[PDB]
Enzyme design. Structure first.
Site, PDB file in Angstrom:
ATOM      1  N   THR A  68       1.146  -1.247   0.143  1.00 23.83           N
ATOM      2  CA  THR A  68       0.117  -0.037  -0.183  1.00 23.83           C
ATOM      3  C   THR A  68       0.377   1.886  -0.029  1.00 23.83           C
ATOM      4  O   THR A  68       0.263   2.730  -0.489  1.00 23.83           O
ATOM      5  CB  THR A  68      -1.091  -0.442   1.384  1.00 23.83           C
ATOM      6  OG1 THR A  68      -0.279  -0.341   2.064  1.00 23.83           O
ATOM      7  CG2 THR A  68      -2.126  -0.647   1.106  1.00 23.83           C
ATOM      8  N   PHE A  82      -6.023   4.855   7.177  1.00 24.40           N
ATOM      9  CA  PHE A  82      -5.435   3.310   7.463  1.00 24.40           C
ATOM     10  C   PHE A  82      -6.660   2.934   8.940  1.00 24.40           C
ATOM     11  O   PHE A  82      -5.650   2.108   9.459  1.00 24.40           O
ATOM     12  CB  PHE A  82      -4.196   4.995   8.611  1.00 24.40           C
ATOM     13  CG  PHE A  82      -3.448   5.388   8.245  1.00 24.40           C
ATOM     14  CD1 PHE A  82      -2.109   4.358   7.172  1.00 24.40           C
ATOM     15  CD2 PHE A  82      -3.770   6.540   7.799  1.00 24.40           C
ATOM     16  CE1 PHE A  82      -1.186   5.148   6.505  1.00 24.40           C
ATOM     17  CE2 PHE A  82      -2.518   6.837   6.640  1.00 24.40           C
ATOM     18  CZ  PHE A  82      -1.557   6.191   6.200  1.00 24.40           C
ATOM     19  N   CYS A 112      -4.014   0.527  11.464  1.00 25.37           N
ATOM     20  CA  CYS A 112      -3.067   0.043  11.405  1.00 25.37           C
ATOM     21  C   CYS A 112      -2.041   0.533  11.752  1.00 25.37           C
ATOM     22  O   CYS A 112      -1.677   1.917  12.431  1.00 25.37           O
ATOM     23  CB  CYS A 112      -2.344   1.082   9.808  1.00 25.37           C
ATOM     24  SG  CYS A 112      -1.289   1.039   8.922  1.00 25.37           S
TER      25      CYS A 112
HETATM   26  C1  HEM Z   1      -0.434   3.423   3.237  1.00 29.89           C
HETATM   27  C2  HEM Z   1       0.562   2.663   3.445  1.00 29.89           C
HETATM   28  C3  HEM Z   1      -0.724   1.908   4.239  1.00 29.89           C
HETATM   29  C4  HEM Z   1      -2.069   2.210   4.260  1.00 29.89           C
HETATM   30  C5  HEM Z   1      -2.509   2.539   3.259  1.00 29.89           C
HETATM   31  C6  HEM Z   1      -2.167   1.201   5.700  1.00 29.89           C
HETATM   32  C7  HEM Z   1      -4.057   0.590   5.782  1.00 29.89           C
HETATM   33  C8  HEM Z   1      -4.410  -0.338   6.270  1.00 29.89           C
HETATM   34  C9  HEM Z   1      -5.403  -0.892   6.853  1.00 29.89           C
HETATM   35  C10 HEM Z   1      -6.822   0.376   6.048  1.00 29.89           C
HETATM   36  C11 HEM Z   1      -5.614  -0.988   7.693  1.00 29.89           C
HETATM   37  C12 HEM Z   1      -7.073  -1.687   8.584  1.00 29.89           C
HETATM   38  C13 HEM Z   1      -7.408  -2.911   7.703  1.00 29.89           C
HETATM   39  C14 HEM Z   1      -8.415  -3.385   8.415  1.00 29.89           C
HETATM   40  O1  HEM Z   1      -9.518  -3.297   9.230  1.00 29.89           O
HETATM   41  O2  HEM Z   1      -9.089  -4.520   8.347  1.00 29.89           O
HETATM   42  C15 HEM Z   1      -4.687  -2.057   8.238  1.00 29.89           C
HETATM   43  C16 HEM Z   1      -4.206  -2.727   9.222  1.00 29.89           C
HETATM   44  C17 HEM Z   1      -2.271  -2.821   9.033  1.00 29.89           C
HETATM   45  N1  HEM Z   1      -1.513  -2.531   8.809  1.00 29.89           N
HETATM   46 FE1  HEM Z   1      -1.405  -1.158   7.453  1.00 29.89          FE
HETATM   47  N2  HEM Z   1      -1.304  -0.159   6.092  1.00 29.89           N
HETATM   48  C18 HEM Z   1      -0.582   1.261   5.129  1.00 29.89           C
HETATM   49  C19 HEM Z   1       0.914   0.373   5.321  1.00 29.89           C
HETATM   50  C20 HEM Z   1       1.357  -0.269   6.752  1.00 29.89           C
HETATM   51  C21 HEM Z   1       2.746  -0.865   7.023  1.00 29.89           C
HETATM   52  C22 HEM Z   1       4.103  -0.154   6.416  1.00 29.89           C
HETATM   53  C23 HEM Z   1       2.356  -1.562   7.757  1.00 29.89           C
HETATM   54  C24 HEM Z   1       3.606  -2.287   8.702  1.00 29.89           C
HETATM   55  C25 HEM Z   1       5.162  -1.838   8.328  1.00 29.89           C
HETATM   56  C26 HEM Z   1       0.933  -2.133   8.529  1.00 29.89           C
HETATM   57  C27 HEM Z   1       0.488  -2.862   9.276  1.00 29.89           C
HETATM   58  C28 HEM Z   1      -0.489  -2.926   9.419  1.00 29.89           C
HETATM   59  C29 HEM Z   1      -1.163  -3.977  10.860  1.00 29.89           C
HETATM   60  C30 HEM Z   1      -0.209  -4.919  11.723  1.00 29.89           C
HETATM   61  C31 HEM Z   1      -2.461  -3.863  10.411  1.00 29.89           C
HETATM   62  C32 HEM Z   1      -3.344  -4.750  11.665  1.00 29.89           C
HETATM   63  C33 HEM Z   1      -3.242  -3.960  12.980  1.00 29.89           C
HETATM   64  C34 HEM Z   1      -4.333  -5.104  13.516  1.00 29.89           C
HETATM   65  O3  HEM Z   1      -5.092  -5.281  13.738  1.00 29.89           O
HETATM   66  O4  HEM Z   1      -3.201  -5.567  14.706  1.00 29.89           O
HETATM   67  N3  HEM Z   1       0.492  -1.186   7.759  1.00 29.89           N
HETATM   68  N4  HEM Z   1      -3.846  -0.887   7.599  1.00 29.89           N
HETATM   69  C1  LIG Z   2      -1.496  -2.241   4.849  1.00 31.62           C
HETATM   70  C2  LIG Z   2      -2.663  -3.597   3.847  1.00 31.62           C
HETATM   71  C3  LIG Z   2      -3.592  -3.775   3.935  1.00 31.62           C
HETATM   72  C4  LIG Z   2      -5.001  -3.050   5.090  1.00 31.62           C
HETATM   73  C5  LIG Z   2      -4.264  -5.163   2.840  1.00 31.62           C
HETATM   74  C6  LIG Z   2      -3.246  -5.690   1.617  1.00 31.62           C
HETATM   75  C7  LIG Z   2      -2.058  -4.851   1.849  1.00 31.62           C
HETATM   76  C8  LIG Z   2      -1.204  -5.753   0.735  1.00 31.62           C
HETATM   77  C9  LIG Z   2      -1.728  -3.943   2.408  1.00 31.62           C
HETATM   78  O1  LIG Z   2      -0.392  -3.137   1.881  1.00 31.62           O
HETATM   79  C10 LIG Z   2      -3.850  -6.866   1.126  1.00 31.62           C
HETATM   80  C11 LIG Z   2      -5.407  -7.074   1.049  1.00 31.62           C
HETATM   81  C12 LIG Z   2      -5.837  -7.228   3.107  1.00 31.62           C
HETATM   82  C13 LIG Z   2      -5.244  -8.233   3.468  1.00 31.62           C
HETATM   83  C14 LIG Z   2      -7.295  -7.082   2.060  1.00 31.62           C
HETATM   84  O2  LIG Z   2      -8.053  -5.279   1.403  1.00 31.62           O
HETATM   85  C15 LIG Z   2      -9.510  -5.439   1.305  1.00 31.62           C
HETATM   86  C16 LIG Z   2      -9.499  -4.561  -0.504  1.00 31.62           C
HETATM   87  C17 LIG Z   2     -11.223  -4.976  -0.621  1.00 31.62           C
HETATM   88  C18 LIG Z   2     -12.024  -5.447   0.380  1.00 31.62           C
HETATM   89  C19 LIG Z   2     -12.950  -5.519  -0.579  1.00 31.62           C
HETATM   90  C20 LIG Z   2     -13.631  -6.497  -1.037  1.00 31.62           C
HETATM   91  S1  LIG Z   2     -15.645  -6.543  -1.598  1.00 31.62           S
HETATM   92  C21 LIG Z   2     -15.098  -6.161  -3.076  1.00 31.62           C
HETATM   93  O3  LIG Z   2     -15.814  -7.220  -3.626  1.00 31.62           O
HETATM   94  N1  LIG Z   2     -13.907  -6.242  -3.343  1.00 31.62           N
HETATM   95  C22 LIG Z   2     -12.854  -6.591  -2.350  1.00 31.62           C
HETATM   96  O4  LIG Z   2     -12.140  -6.311  -2.870  1.00 31.62           O
HETATM   97  C23 LIG Z   2     -11.471  -6.373   1.111  1.00 31.62           C
HETATM   98  C24 LIG Z   2     -10.019  -6.066   1.638  1.00 31.62           C
HETATM   99  O5  LIG Z   2      -5.244  -5.520   2.893  1.00 31.62           O
END
Ligand code: HEM
Ligand SMILES: Cc1c(C)c2c(c(C)c1O)CC[C@](C)(COc1ccc(C[C@H]3SC(=O)NC3=O)cc1)O2
EC number: 1.14.14.1
Length: 453
Positions: free
Chosen positions: A266, A391, A398
């Protein structure tokens, strides 16, 4: 109040309405037709897609809604396991790993990572400095080289050496295919049809490629004579205060895969979208470049200087507003409840937040939601309330948000300091979906300003 829902097709329900390699963008169109909420059914599941800040604000009330493992997360769990992204909040290993790994994202830890981020950023700059005049830059490909190597080095003291490869790193190729498979499985009516046997065999092969890489990371740490205190150190040595036990070996492997993938994909998308919007908005590019030159006065950036790149940070947030690269997260009703005083929900009902739609809510952002205007974020009083959620939400938000933004701000600042960028093809935005979002085919030319490094 009746729940809007698009056309159904017998026992296939709404599934035929996707049938696309760009499902989120298709869902955005449906949201534009039906408004702030609509029900969407596939065989075997129901989802309610939210688009308004009014409803999403309620969905983010953790006393009433908890993080859900969407079908997408359940498929990704086939290689993320019970790591932080794909574990239930009340699954023991979520809280345990959260407590053990949160110190790796403290302010003091971030400052420790800066030098290694600069290591990879310098490699990116040098690659572009060394291109001949007839060559060009594959933007998302090079951003992936940078972001993967950064999390590999900062988190695991492991060098992917992506800039020593002219094609994508094999780990990336397997990751993309695995994420694509998970996305495609959401749309296929008959998953056990023999036509998908090759997909399943490839899926297992890509999971193995990922785990062979984990083996090297673990083996190289075991052999190291240096003392690290990075993410991997905490995975291996951190203890649950209640039991005195560390994360089990199986979970550790899952956390490594989780952070290698979640910790770069991401961020590569963000940097790609940001550079796209910059080359399409020359005055914004000039302002960002002027800040980079003004602030980054030394041969390489210091941690403090990255923090003074205010406008670059606004550029990145505005890129995340329009195209949040993790475009959705899922919640479920903890009990029977009413949403928005209008929509009754039963315990366990799924709510899916469509982040791109939230970020286009005109009652919040004004009418110009499609414009790229970083100045949206320059006047604090004029920035809305709980309307910006790239995030996630709450205790499942995140964990690496500041890691991502520091890396992106550092690199974008260095890019803007060292080059002029040309949109030499007049590229038309094409957003590839692999659950996450990222431009595809985005190419530029970068003319060096000849500032030593
Ligand atoms: C643009 C960069 C990033 C975006 C937009 C992003 C976005 C998100 C989002 C939306 C979630 C929540 C997903 C959910 O609720 O199911 C999430 C969870 C998480 N992200 Fe990221 N993320 C980014 C980068 C990173 C990076 C660089 C790391 C680690 C190096 C990271 C580690 C995590 C972890 C560990 C979670 C789950 C936390 C938990 O549920 O305990 N993410 N991220
Ligand atoms: C920070 C981060 C996150 C949060 C991440 C991913 C990456 C690679 C990341 O770096 C992979 C997917 C995933 C585990 C899940 O992302 C989703 C994207 C779209 C959807 C919506 C479903 S509903 C539908 O019909 N089409 C979809 O993609 C659910 C989860 O989230």
């Amino acid at each position: 109040k009746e729940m809007p829902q698009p056309k159904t097709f017998g026992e296939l329900k709404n599934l035929p309405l996707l049938n696309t390699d760009k499902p989120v963008q298709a869902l955005m169109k449906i949201a534009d037709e039906l408004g702030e909420i609509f029900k969407f059914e596939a065989p075997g599941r129901v989802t309610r897609y939210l688009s308004s800040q009014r409803l999403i604000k309620e969905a983010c009330d953790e006393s009433r809604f908890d993080k859900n493992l969407s079908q997408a997360l359940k498929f990704v769990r086939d290689f993320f396991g019970d790591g932080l992204v794909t574990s239930w909040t009340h699954e023991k290993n979520w809280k345990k790993a959260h407590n053990i790994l949160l110190p790796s994202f403290s302010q003091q830890a971030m400052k420790g990572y800066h030098a290694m981020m600069v290591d990879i950023a310098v490699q990116l700059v040098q690659k572009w400095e060394r291109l001949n005049a007839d060559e060009h830059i594959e933007v998302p490909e090079d951003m992936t080289r940078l972001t993967l190597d950064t999390i590999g080095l900062c988190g695991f003291n492991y060098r992917f050496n992506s800039f020593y490869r002219d094609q994508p790193h094999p780990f990336i190729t397997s990751m993309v295919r695995a994420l694509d498979e998970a996305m495609n499985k959401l749309q296929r009516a008959n998953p056990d049809d023999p036509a998908y046997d090759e997909n399943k065999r490839q899926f297992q092969e890509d999971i193995k490629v990922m785990n062979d890489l984990v083996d090297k990371i673990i083996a190289d740490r075991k052999a190291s004579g240096e003392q690290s205190d990075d993410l991997l150190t905490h995975m291996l040595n951190g203890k649950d205060p209640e039991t005195g036990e560390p994360l089990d070996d199986e979970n550790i492997r899952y956390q490594i895969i989780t952070f290698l993938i979640a910790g770069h994909e991401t961020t590569s998308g963000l940097l790609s979208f940001a550079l796209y919007f910059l080359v399409k908005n020359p005055h914004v590019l000039q302002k960002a470049a002027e800040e980079a030159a003004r602030v980054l006065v030394d041969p390489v950036p210091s941690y403090k200087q990255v923090k003074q790149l205010k406008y670059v940070g606004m550029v990145l947030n505005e890129a995340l507003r329009l195209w949040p690269t993790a475009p959705a997260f899922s919640l479920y009703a903890k009990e029977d409840t009413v949403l928005g005083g209008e929509y009754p929900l039963e315990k366990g009902d799924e709510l899916m937040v469509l982040i791109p739609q939230l970020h286009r809510d005109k009652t919040i952002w004004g009418d110009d939601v499609e414009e790229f205007r970083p100045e949206r974020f320059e006047n604090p009083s004029a920035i809305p309330q709980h309307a910006f959620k790239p995030f996630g939400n709450g205790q499942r938000a995140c964990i690496g948000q500041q890691f991502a933004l520091h890396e992106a701000t550092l690199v974008l600042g260095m890019m803007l300091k060292h080059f002029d960028f040309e949109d030499h093809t007049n590229y038309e935005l094409d957003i590839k979906e692999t659950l996450t979002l990222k431009p595809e085919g985005f190419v530029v030319k970068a003319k060096s300003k000849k500032i030593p490094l």
